[model samples]
Target: DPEDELKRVEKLVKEAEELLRQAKEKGSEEDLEKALRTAEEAAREAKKVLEQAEKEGDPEVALRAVELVVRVAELLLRIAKESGSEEALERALRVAEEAARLAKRVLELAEKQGDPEVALRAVELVVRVAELLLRIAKESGSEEALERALRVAEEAARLAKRVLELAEKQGDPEVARRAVELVKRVAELLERIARESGSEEAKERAERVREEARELQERVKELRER
Candidate 1:
């Protein structure tokens, strides 16, 4: 059931992606609606795969399933942006929440396996969710969405920092570089949140993250130079 469900998730996501592509190309609301419907189904199927993987205690399977769900969220976000529909944005947020939860599970499992690379990948998935939410927040001009984005971005920055420390301990330049990039992205997200939210709290958070990003870049540079 897991294997079949995995295949179904992939196929459904592919079809949803194609539908979204056509929707954008044609600028058709009808196709966009169809894409959202298909994407929702894909996310639903991916959840089943993730549930089964968790039951089997297979992080690899869970990672793959969650990655596909992130793709579904991406497609849903695109549909939201294209259609400017609150419903689509709501759907995207729900899908993103699911991706974030599974990504965290994968991070825990990868850490248990002493696999920093997989853990970094999990962090990247969370970054993608943050990025998606940031996009929605920008489009909707919703303070609530911006606050949510900030929370997720902060979590991503924290996860990246943990992975970067592991990479430093292992002297893994590749992982350090990737982790630094994630940190920088989170910093950028914070900056955007500061601008979008225009709250003193957001500005302070953004400035702090920006400084951290600068330090992280320097550390990564030193590692690469070595």
Candidate 2:
């Protein structure tokens, strides 16, 4: 049974990787819409692997599957950053941000109750991907890219806070504290990017955008309290 499960998951992971490669190629060509579609498909397949792994009592496999999901989310975010249409970029960013949040939560839960090693592995994967994401956001200089990066940063901050809340509820004080720190770090980095990406006037405009995101995070915190 273990071998069978492993084989099935391996096949799924392979197919998902192939789709990710195609998505990356499409993104390189600036075909964002197609890239988004392919990336989403890849994420869906990775989700299946995660579910299967959970059923098979393999937290390591589940963590690996979630890592693939994160990769897809990163690709989608890049596509959104490069797109010409604001609406499309917004939609893609939303998807990518949510996927990242979900991946984080899954890894946290696995660590708390399933397997500590697997959980650590998952966290390492997230941190590495986040570093890459930060670099991508930094390199993106266009208005569209700046806007998307700002949005993604805000979303990530909110998500990290939520994950922290979950950790606190789960009685993992250290994890919760780390989550808060991460959110702050991400916010600071994003704010700096917004300031540097444009002129003085543009920075002022971007500040307004950043304020809206701040308010949103505050609201989420309020809701979490209640």
Candidate 3:
């Protein structure tokens, strides 16, 4: 029975990968028509893989599917980037970052066994993806892009802090340390972007957002110790 389940999951992962490859090859033509279709299919299949992995208690499979989902998100962001339209880029970045966050959660779940190496690798991947997204937001030069970037950065910073707490609760020192570093890096990036944009009002707003994130992070940190 377990073998059958594994086979099913493998099939789903393969299908997802196929769709993702198709999407990547199609590129940004005809208003991203084909790319969008294929990318959605890939994401849907990835979700199915995640569900199946959970049902079967297969963390490895789940992690693999999560990686696929991250790739799908990256492709979607690339499509949006190619469009060169502020609205499209913002929407695409949001989707990509959301997918990345989910992937990070999956990685955390997969590393629950206190495997320092695996957890470290997962943290590295998550941080790199977040950084790439932050760069995109910073470079977009549109008000909409800036707003989306701020929202996503804040969201990511919050998530990283939350995950760090989770890691500490699990007594995973490596994960906790890495996550804390990521949270701080994301916060600094958000602050720098806000300050450099020459919009004092926007910078103040961003600072407020960061304050909220810090507050949440602090609460979670306290809760984890209790």
Candidate 4:
């Protein structure tokens, strides 16, 4: 029965995450809201299951549960961000807090494993979730949010650099190609920020970020060619 229960826990957690993703990705507003609420309801349930996994003292299960928890937070924040509701920013903040905490655990496991696939994804989540947070922060227009966005952007850039290093080291052309794509995405974000940002200092910083991403993209292109 322990085995049966364990399988159930895993299934429910995955289904809960899927619900969050489906909600975040597409559907009507009512549809999206219904899915978001359902996903949150399941999050509480998944927490209990994760606690059991932790109490059982299974590292693999513990790691998997925590990783899924982070992903759920990421998807939640995305939905909240898309709403563009200032009230929703609070939820995004909460989700980012959870994601940052959970990502540390995920990163530790990935580092120990040294599997490029795992490591790359772990880093990508940190970058992506941070980008979502930045989106909310910019819209909020509070100095605090601005500071947080700057910090997260720096962190994401550092991680993106690591992604490039790992992708290049593996000599996997596909991953290397994606690294260039990643650089371009970051550059695009910065260019938009530069154009919209009113502060001269902020615009300059965005310009610098765009240039740096461009330079990295060039390096990734060479790596892919090799």
Could you say which candidate leads in TM-score?
1
Displacement of the residue 14 alpha carbon in candidate 4, Å: 11
lDDT of 4 by residue, 1-226 (tens): 3345445645654664565466556655765565456545545554455456545544355445555555555556556666666655676576665665455445555445454455556555666665666666766666666566555655555565665676677666566456556555655655565567654445655666667677886887787566
Ranking by TM-score: 1, 4, 3, 2
- Model 4, position 12: C-alpha lDDT score: 55
lDDT of 2 by residue, 139-160 (tens): 4434554454455555545555
Error of 1 at 139 (Å): 2.2
Q: Which ten residues in a row have the lowest lDDT in candidate 1?
A: 193-202
Model 4 segments beyond 4 Å from truth?
1-91, 138-140, 199-202, 221-226
How far does residue 170 in candidate 2 sit from its true spot (Å)?
3.3
- Model 2, residue 60: distance off in Å is 6.4
Candidate 3 per-residue C-alpha lDDT over 1-226 given as tens digits, one digit per residue, 9 for 90 to 100: 4345445545544554455455456652543655555666666767677777666656666666666666666666666665565655565566566566666666566556444444444555565555556566665754555565455555556555556656666776556656666666666765676567665544664576567556655655665576
List lDDT for all candidates, in order.
0.81, 0.54, 0.59, 0.58
What local lDDT score does residue 195 receive in model 1, on the 0 to 100 scale? 75
Candidate 4, residue 89: Cα displacement in angstroms equals: 4.7
Task: Record all residue pairs in model 3 with backbone atoms less than 3 Å apart, i.e. clashing.
Answer: none
lDDT of residue 77 for candidate 3: 63
Model 4 poorest ten-residue lDDT run: 54-63
Which digits, one per residue and each the tens of the lDDT, describe model 1 over residues 1-226?
6777888889998888888889888777787777888888888878788787777777777788899998898888778877878888888888887788789888887767667888899898888888777777777778777678778878888788778877887788799888888887777767766776576666777777777778888988888888
- Candidate with more favorable, higher TM-score: 1 or 3: 1
